CSV table of C-alpha atoms in Angstrom, one decimal:
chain,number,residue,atom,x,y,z
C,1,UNK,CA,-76.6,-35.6,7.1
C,2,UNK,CA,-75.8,-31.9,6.5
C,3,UNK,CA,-78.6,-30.3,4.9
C,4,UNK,CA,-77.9,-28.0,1.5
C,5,UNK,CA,-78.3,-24.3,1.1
C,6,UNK,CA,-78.6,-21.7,-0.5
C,7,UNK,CA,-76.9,-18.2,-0.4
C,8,UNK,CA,-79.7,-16.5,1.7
C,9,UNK,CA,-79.1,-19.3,4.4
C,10,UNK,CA,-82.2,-20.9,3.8
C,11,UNK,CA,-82.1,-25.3,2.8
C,12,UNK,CA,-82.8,-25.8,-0.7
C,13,UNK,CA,-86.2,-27.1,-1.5
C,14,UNK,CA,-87.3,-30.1,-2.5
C,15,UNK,CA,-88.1,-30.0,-6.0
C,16,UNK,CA,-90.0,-26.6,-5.0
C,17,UNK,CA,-87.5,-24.3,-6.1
C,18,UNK,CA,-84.9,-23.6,-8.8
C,19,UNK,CA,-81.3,-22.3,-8.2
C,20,UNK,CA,-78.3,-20.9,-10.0
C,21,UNK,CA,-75.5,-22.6,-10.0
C,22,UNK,CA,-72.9,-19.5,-9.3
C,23,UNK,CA,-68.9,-21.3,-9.5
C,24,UNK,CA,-66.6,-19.6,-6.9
C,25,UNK,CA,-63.9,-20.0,-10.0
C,26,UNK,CA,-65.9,-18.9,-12.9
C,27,UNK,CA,-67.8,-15.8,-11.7
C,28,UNK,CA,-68.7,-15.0,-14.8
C,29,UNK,CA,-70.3,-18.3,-15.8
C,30,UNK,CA,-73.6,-19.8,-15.6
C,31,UNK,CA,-74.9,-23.1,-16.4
C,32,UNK,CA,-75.9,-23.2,-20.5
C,33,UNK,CA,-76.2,-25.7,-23.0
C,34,UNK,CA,-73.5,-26.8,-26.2
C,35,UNK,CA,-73.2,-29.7,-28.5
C,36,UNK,CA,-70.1,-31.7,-27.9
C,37,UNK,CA,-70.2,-33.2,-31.5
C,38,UNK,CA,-72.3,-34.1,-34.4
C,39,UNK,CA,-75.2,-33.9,-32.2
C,40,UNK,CA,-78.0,-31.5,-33.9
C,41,UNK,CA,-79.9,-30.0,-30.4
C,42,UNK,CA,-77.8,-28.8,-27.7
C,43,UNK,CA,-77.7,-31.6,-25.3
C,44,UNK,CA,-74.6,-31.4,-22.9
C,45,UNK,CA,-74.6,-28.9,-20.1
C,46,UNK,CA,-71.3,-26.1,-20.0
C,47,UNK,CA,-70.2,-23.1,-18.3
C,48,UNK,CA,-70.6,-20.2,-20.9
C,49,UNK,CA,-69.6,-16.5,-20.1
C,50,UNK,CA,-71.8,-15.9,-23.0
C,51,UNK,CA,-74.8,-17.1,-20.5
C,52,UNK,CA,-75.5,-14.8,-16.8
C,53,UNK,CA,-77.8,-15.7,-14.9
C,54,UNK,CA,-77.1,-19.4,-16.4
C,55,UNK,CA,-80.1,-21.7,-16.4
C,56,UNK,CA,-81.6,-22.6,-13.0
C,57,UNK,CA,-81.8,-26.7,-11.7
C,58,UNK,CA,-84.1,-28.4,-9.4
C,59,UNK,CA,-83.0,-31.0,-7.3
C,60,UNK,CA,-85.9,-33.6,-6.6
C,61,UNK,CA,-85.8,-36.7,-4.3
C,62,UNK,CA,-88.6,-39.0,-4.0
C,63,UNK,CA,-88.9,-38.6,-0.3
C,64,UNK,CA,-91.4,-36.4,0.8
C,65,UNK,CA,-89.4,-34.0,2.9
C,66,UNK,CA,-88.8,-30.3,1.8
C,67,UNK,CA,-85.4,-30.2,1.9
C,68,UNK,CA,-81.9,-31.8,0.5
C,69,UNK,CA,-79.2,-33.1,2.7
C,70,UNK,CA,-75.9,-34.6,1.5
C,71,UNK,CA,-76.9,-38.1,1.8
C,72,UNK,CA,-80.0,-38.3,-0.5
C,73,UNK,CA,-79.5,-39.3,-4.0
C,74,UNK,CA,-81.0,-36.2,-5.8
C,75,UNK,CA,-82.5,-36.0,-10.1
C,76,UNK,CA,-81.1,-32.8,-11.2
C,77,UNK,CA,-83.2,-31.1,-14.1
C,78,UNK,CA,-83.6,-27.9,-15.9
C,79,UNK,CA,-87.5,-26.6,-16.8
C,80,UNK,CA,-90.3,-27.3,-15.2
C,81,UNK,CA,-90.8,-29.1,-11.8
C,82,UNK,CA,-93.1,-31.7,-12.8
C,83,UNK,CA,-91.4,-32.2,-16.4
C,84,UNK,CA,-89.1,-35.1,-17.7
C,85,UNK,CA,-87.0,-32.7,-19.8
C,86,UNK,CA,-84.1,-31.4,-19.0
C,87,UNK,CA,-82.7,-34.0,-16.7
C,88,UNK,CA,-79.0,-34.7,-16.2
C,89,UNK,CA,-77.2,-37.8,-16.7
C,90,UNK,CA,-74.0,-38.7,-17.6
C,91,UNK,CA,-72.8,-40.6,-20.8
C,92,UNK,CA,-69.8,-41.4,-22.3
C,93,UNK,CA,-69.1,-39.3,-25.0
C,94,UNK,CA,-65.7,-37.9,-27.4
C,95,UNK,CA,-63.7,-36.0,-27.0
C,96,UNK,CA,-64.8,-34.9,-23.7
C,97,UNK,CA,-65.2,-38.0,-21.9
C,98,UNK,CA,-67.9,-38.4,-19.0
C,99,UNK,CA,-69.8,-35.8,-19.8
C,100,UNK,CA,-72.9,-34.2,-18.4
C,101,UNK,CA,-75.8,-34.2,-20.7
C,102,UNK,CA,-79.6,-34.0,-20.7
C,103,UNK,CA,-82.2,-36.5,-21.3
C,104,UNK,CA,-86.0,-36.6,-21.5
C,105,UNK,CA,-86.3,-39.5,-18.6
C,106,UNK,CA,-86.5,-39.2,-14.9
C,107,UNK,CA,-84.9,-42.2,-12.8
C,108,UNK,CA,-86.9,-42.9,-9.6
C,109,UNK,CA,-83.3,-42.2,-7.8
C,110,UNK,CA,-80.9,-39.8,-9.6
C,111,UNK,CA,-77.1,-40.3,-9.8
C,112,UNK,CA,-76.6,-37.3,-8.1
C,113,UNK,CA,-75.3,-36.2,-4.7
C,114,UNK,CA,-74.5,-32.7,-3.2
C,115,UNK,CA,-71.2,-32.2,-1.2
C,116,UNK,CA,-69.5,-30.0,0.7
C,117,UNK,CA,-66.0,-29.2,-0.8
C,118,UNK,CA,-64.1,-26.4,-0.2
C,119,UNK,CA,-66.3,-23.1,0.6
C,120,UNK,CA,-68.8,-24.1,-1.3
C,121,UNK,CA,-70.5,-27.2,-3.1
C,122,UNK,CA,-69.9,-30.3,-5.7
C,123,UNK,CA,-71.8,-32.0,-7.6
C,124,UNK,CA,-71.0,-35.7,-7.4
C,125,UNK,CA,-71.8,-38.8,-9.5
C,126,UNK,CA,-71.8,-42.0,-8.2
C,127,UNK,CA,-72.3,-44.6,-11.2
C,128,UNK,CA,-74.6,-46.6,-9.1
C,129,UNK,CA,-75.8,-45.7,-5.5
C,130,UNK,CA,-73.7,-48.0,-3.4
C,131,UNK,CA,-70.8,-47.1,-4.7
C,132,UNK,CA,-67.7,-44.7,-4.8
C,133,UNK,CA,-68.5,-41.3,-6.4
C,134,UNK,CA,-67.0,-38.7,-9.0
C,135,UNK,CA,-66.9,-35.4,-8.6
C,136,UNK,CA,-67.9,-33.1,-11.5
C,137,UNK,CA,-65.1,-30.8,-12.5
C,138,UNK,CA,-64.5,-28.7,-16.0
C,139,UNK,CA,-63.3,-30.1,-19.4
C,140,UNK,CA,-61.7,-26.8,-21.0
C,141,UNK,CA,-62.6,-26.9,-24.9
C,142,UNK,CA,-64.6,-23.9,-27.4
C,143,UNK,CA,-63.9,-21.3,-24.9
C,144,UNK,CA,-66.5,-22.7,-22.7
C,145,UNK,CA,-66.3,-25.3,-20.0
C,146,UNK,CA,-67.9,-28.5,-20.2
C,147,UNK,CA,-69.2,-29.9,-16.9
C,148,UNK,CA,-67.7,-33.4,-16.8
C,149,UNK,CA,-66.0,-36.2,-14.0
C,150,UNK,CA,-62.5,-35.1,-13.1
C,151,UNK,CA,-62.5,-36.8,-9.8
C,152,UNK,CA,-59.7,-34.9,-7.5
C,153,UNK,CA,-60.4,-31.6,-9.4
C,154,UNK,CA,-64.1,-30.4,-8.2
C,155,UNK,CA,-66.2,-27.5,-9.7
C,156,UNK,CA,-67.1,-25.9,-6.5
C,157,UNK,CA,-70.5,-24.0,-6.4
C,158,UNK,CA,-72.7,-21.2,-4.8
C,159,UNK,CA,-76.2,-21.9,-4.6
C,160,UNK,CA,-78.0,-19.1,-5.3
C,161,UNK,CA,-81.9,-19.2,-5.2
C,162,UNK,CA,-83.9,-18.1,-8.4
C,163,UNK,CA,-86.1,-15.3,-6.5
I,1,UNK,CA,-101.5,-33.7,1.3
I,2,UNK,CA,-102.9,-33.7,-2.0
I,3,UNK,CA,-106.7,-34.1,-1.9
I,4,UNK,CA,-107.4,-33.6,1.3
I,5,UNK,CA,-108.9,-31.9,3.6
I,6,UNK,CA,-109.1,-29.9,6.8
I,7,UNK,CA,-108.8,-31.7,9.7
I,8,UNK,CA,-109.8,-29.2,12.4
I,9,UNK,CA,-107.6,-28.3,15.6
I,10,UNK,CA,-108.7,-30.6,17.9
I,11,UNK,CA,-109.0,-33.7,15.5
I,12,UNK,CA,-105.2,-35.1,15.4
I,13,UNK,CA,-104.5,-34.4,18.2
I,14,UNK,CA,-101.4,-37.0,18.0
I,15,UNK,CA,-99.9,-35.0,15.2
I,16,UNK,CA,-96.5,-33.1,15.5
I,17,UNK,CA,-94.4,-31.0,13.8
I,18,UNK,CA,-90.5,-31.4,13.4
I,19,UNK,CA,-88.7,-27.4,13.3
I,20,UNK,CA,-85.9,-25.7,13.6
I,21,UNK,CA,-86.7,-22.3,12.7
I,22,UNK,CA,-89.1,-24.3,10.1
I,23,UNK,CA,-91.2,-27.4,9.7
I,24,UNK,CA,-90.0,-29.8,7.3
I,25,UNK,CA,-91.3,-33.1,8.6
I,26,UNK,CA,-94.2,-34.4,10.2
I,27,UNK,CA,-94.5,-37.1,13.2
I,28,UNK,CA,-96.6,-39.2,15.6
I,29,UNK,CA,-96.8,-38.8,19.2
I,30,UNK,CA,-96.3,-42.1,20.8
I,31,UNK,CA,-97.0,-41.7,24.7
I,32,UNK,CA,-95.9,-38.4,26.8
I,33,UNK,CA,-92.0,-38.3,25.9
I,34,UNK,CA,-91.5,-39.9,22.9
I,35,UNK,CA,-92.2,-38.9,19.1
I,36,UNK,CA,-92.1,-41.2,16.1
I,37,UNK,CA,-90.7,-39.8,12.5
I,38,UNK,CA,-88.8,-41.2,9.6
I,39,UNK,CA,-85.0,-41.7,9.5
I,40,UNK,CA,-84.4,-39.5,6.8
I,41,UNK,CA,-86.2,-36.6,8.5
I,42,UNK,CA,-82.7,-36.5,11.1
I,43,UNK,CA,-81.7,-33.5,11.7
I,44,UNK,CA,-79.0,-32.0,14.8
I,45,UNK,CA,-80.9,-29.8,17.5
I,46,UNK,CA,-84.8,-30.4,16.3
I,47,UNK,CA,-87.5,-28.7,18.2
I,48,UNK,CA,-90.7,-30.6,18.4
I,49,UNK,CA,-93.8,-28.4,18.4
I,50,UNK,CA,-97.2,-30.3,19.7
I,51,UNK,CA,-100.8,-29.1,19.3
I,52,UNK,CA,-100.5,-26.5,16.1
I,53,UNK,CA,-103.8,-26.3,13.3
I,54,UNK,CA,-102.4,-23.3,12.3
I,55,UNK,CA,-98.2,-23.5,12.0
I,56,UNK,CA,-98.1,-19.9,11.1
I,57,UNK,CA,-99.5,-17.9,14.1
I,58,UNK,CA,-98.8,-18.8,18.2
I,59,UNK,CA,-102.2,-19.9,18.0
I,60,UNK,CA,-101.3,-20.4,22.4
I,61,UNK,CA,-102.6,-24.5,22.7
I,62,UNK,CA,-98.9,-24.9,21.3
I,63,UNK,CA,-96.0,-26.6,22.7
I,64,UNK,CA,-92.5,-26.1,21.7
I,65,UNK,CA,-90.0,-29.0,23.5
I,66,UNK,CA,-87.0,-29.6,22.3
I,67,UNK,CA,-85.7,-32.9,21.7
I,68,UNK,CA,-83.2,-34.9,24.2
I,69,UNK,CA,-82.1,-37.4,21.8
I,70,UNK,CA,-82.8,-38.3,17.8
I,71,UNK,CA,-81.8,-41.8,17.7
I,72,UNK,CA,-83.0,-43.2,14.0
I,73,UNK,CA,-82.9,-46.7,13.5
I,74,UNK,CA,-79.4,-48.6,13.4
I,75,UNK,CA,-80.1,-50.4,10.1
I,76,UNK,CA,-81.2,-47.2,8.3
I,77,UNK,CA,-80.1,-47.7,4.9
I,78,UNK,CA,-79.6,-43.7,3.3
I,79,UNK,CA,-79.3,-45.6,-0.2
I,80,UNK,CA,-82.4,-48.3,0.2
I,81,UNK,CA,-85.0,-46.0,2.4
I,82,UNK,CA,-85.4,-49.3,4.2
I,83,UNK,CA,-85.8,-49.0,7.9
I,84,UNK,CA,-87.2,-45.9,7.4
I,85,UNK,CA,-88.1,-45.0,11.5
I,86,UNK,CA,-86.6,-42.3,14.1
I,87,UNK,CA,-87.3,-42.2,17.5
I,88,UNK,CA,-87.5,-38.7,19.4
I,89,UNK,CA,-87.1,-38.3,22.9
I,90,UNK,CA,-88.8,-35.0,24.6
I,91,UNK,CA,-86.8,-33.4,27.0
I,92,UNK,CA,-89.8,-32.8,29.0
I,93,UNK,CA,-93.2,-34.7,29.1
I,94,UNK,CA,-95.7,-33.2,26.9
I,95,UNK,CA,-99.5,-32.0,28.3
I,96,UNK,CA,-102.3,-34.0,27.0
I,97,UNK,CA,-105.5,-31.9,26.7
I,98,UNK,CA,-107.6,-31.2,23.9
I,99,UNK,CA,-105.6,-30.3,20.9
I,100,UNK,CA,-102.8,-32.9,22.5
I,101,UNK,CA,-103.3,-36.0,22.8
I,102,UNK,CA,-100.7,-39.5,22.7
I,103,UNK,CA,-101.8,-42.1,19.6
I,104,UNK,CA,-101.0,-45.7,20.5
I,105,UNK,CA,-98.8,-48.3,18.8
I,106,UNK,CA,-100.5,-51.1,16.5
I,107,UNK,CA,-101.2,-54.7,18.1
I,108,UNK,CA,-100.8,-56.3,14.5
I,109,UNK,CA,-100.5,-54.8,10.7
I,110,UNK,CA,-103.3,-53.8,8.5
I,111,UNK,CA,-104.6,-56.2,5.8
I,112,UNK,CA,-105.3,-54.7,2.1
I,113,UNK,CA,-108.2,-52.4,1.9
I,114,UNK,CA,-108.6,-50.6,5.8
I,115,UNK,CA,-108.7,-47.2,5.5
I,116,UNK,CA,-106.5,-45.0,6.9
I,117,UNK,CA,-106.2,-41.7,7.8
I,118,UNK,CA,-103.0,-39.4,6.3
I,119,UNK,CA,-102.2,-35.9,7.7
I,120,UNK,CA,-99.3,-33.2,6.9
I,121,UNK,CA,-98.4,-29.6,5.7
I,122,UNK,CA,-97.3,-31.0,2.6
I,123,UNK,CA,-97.8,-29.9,-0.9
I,124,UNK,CA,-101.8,-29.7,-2.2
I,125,UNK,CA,-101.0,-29.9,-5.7
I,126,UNK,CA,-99.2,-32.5,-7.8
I,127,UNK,CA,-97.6,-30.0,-10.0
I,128,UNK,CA,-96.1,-27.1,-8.7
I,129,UNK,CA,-96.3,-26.0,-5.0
I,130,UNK,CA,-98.6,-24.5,-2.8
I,131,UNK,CA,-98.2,-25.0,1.3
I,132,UNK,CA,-101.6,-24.4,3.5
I,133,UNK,CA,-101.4,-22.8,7.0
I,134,UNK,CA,-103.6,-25.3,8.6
I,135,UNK,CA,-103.6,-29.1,8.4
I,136,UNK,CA,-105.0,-31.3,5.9
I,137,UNK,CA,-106.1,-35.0,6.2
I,138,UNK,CA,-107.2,-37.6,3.6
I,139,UNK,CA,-108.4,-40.9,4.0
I,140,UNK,CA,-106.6,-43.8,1.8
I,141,UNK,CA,-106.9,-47.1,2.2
I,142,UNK,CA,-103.8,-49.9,2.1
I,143,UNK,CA,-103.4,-51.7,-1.3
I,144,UNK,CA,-101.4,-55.1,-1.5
I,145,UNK,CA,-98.2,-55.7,-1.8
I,146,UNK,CA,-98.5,-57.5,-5.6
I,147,UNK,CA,-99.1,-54.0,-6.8
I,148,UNK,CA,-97.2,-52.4,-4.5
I,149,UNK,CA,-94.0,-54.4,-6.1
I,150,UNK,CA,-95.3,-53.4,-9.5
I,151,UNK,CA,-95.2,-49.7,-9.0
I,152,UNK,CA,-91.9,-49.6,-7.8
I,153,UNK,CA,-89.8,-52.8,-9.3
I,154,UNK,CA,-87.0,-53.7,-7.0
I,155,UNK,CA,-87.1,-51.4,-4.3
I,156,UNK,CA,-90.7,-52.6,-2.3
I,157,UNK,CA,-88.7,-53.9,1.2
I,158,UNK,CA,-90.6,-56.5,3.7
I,159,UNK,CA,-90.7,-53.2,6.2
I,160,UNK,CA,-93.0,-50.9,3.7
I,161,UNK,CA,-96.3,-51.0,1.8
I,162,UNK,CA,-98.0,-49.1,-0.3
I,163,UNK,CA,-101.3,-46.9,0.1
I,164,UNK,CA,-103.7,-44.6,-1.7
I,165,UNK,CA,-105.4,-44.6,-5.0
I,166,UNK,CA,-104.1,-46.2,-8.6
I,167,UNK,CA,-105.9,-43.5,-10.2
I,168,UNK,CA,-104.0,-40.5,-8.8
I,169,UNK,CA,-105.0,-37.3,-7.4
I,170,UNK,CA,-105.3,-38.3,-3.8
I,171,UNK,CA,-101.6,-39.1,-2.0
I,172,UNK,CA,-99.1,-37.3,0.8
I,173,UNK,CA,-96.4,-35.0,-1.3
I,174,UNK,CA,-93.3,-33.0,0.1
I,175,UNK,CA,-93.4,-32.0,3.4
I,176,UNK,CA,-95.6,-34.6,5.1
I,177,UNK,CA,-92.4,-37.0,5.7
I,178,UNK,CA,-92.6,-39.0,9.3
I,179,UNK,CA,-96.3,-38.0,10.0
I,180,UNK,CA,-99.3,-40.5,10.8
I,181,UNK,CA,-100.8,-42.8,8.7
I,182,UNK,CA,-103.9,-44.5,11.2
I,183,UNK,CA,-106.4,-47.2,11.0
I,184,UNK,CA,-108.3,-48.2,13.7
I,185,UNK,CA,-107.3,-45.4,15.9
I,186,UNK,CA,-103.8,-47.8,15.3
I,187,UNK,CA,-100.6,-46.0,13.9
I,188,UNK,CA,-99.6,-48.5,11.4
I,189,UNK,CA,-97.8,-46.3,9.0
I,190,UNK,CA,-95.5,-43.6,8.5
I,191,UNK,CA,-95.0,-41.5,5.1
I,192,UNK,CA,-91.4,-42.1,3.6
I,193,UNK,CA,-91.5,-41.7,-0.1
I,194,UNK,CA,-93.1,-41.9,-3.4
I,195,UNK,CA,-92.7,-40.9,-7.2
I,196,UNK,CA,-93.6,-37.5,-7.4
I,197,UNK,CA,-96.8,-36.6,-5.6
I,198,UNK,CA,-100.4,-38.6,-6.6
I,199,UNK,CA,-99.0,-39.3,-10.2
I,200,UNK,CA,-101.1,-42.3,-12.2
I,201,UNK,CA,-99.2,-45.5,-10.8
I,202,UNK,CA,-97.2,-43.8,-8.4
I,203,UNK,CA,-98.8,-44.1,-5.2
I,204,UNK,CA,-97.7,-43.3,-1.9
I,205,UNK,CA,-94.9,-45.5,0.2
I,206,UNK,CA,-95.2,-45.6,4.0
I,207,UNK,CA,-92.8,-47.5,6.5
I,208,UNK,CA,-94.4,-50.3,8.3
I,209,UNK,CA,-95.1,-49.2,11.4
I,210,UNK,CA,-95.7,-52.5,13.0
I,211,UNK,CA,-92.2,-54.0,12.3
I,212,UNK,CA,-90.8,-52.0,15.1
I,213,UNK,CA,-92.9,-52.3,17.8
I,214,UNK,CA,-90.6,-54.5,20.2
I,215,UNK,CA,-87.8,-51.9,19.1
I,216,UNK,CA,-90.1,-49.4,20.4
I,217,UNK,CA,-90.3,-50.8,23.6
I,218,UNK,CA,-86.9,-51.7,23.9
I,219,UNK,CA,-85.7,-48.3,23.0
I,220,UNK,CA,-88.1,-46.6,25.2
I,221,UNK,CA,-87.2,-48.9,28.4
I,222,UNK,CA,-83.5,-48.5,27.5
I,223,UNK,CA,-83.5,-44.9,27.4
């Protein structure tokens, strides 16, 4: 019922705006792309110090309000507002596991929920929208840090809004 | 509202903003105490504001009352959008006058085809973003339910229906959430949700207004 915000104090936009994802435990990391494996375009989404500010998101829900609260299942994509690139999902995938990785399709409800934990924000997957969820926590591997499901073990975000 | 156009100040006169600090919703103005809005738009401590054109400037026809209770409707649903309805309780009676006036509930639903009247402070553009000062309106009429179930397999409840255009470009976007939809000088409808904003076989999704009408009552004599 809470409603999400950004570092200014003001509730994250529908779709409207972008954001940096700024991790309390990683201040030097911002969100970036990497292959996991054979994979020839950069498809799963990691923490690289090699990457400040990191790419911004945009969270859209189909309901016609302006902002986000915790309980709306939320699409999560990089680019363009109106786009279909850039959209997260998560797929099982070696060595990693459940990782987080970008397709070119837009569910009408995304897997996606945003939770406060700790002092700041998780993102959390929920397989299917009736159901328990994950939260999203850091796979350590290449001297990055692969956004994936460690549930117990959250990545805790700052929202910070693109300007 | 995407498509639209101005309304004028004195011509909803039953529309209302949700704020607190900022508008984010719209809703319907039911008799003197009581606002209608969607579930979703819930929110702790919401200040109503009655009469505004312009949201931007005191234009002084204005109201600002504050809300007494939020009560959304028990068998909301934050995973199905079904039930989609919130009832607000003023903590003082509005002032009808000119630029404020009460819109009454419907005696039955709308068939396919009546046009309807949508307002909001919504988005004007399908792509991108751009929020007007004043309010906009569009007329849309209601399409049937066959197509409404083939926009949006699975998830078309017996409490919604569907309204606008097939071909795009006229629809409610972002921002217009719990305001009027009207036909016949009737609120039948209220805008909930839809697939992006006036996209090619994405049309708009409003809560069915007339579902609720004995819950209207009931809640309004309870309380």
């Amino acid at each position: 019922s809470s409603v999400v915000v950004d570092t200014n104090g003001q509730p994250v936009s529908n779709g409207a705006d972008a954001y940096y994802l700024v991790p309390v435990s990683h201040g030097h990391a911002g969100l970036a792309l990497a292959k996991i494996g054979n994979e020839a375009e950069p498809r799963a989404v990691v923490l690289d110090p090699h990457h400040r500010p990191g790419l911004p998101v945009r969270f859209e829900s189909p309901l016609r309000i302006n902002i986000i609260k915790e309980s709306y299942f939320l699409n999560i994509k990089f680019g363009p507002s109106s786009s279909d690139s850039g959209v997260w999902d998560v797929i099982q995938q070696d060595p990693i596991g459940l990782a987080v990785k970008v397709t070119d399709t837009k569910s009408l409800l995304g897997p996606f929920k945003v939770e406060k934990e700790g002092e700041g924000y998780k993102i959390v997957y929920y397989p299917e929208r009736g159901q328990t969820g994950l939260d999203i926590g850091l796979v350590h591997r290449n001297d990055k840090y692969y956004l994936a499901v460690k549930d117990g073990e959250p990545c805790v975000f700052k929202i910070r809004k693109a300007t | 509202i995407v498509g639209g156009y101005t309304c004028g100040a004195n011509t909803v006169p039953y529309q209302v903003s949700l704020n607190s600090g900022y508008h984010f919703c719209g809703g319907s103005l039911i008799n003197s105490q009581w606002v209608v809005s969607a579930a979703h738009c819930y929110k702790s401590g919401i200040q109503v504001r009655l009469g505004e054109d312009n949201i931007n400037v005191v234009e002084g026809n204005e109201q600002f009352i504050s809300a007494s209770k939020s009560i959304v409707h028990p068998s909301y649903n934050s995973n199905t959008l079904n039930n989609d309805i919130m009832l607000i309780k003023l903590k003082s009676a509005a002032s009808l006058n000119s630029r404020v006036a009460s819109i009454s509930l419907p005696t039955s639903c709308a068939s396919a085809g009546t046009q309807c009247l949508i307002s909001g402070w919504g988005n004007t553009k399908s792509s991108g973003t751009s929020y007007p000062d004043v309010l906009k309106c569009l007329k849309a009429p209601i399409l049937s339910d066959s197509s409404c179930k083939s926009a949006y397999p699975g998830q078309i409840t017996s409490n919604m229906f569907c309204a606008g255009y097939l071909e795009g470009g006229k629809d409610s976007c972002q921002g217009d959430s719990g305001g009027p939809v009207v036909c016949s000088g009737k609120l039948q409808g209220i805008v909930s949700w839809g697939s992006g904003c006036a996209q090619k076989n994405k049309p708009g999704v409003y809560t069915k207004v007339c579902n609720y009408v004995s819950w209207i009552k009931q809640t309004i004599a309870s309380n």
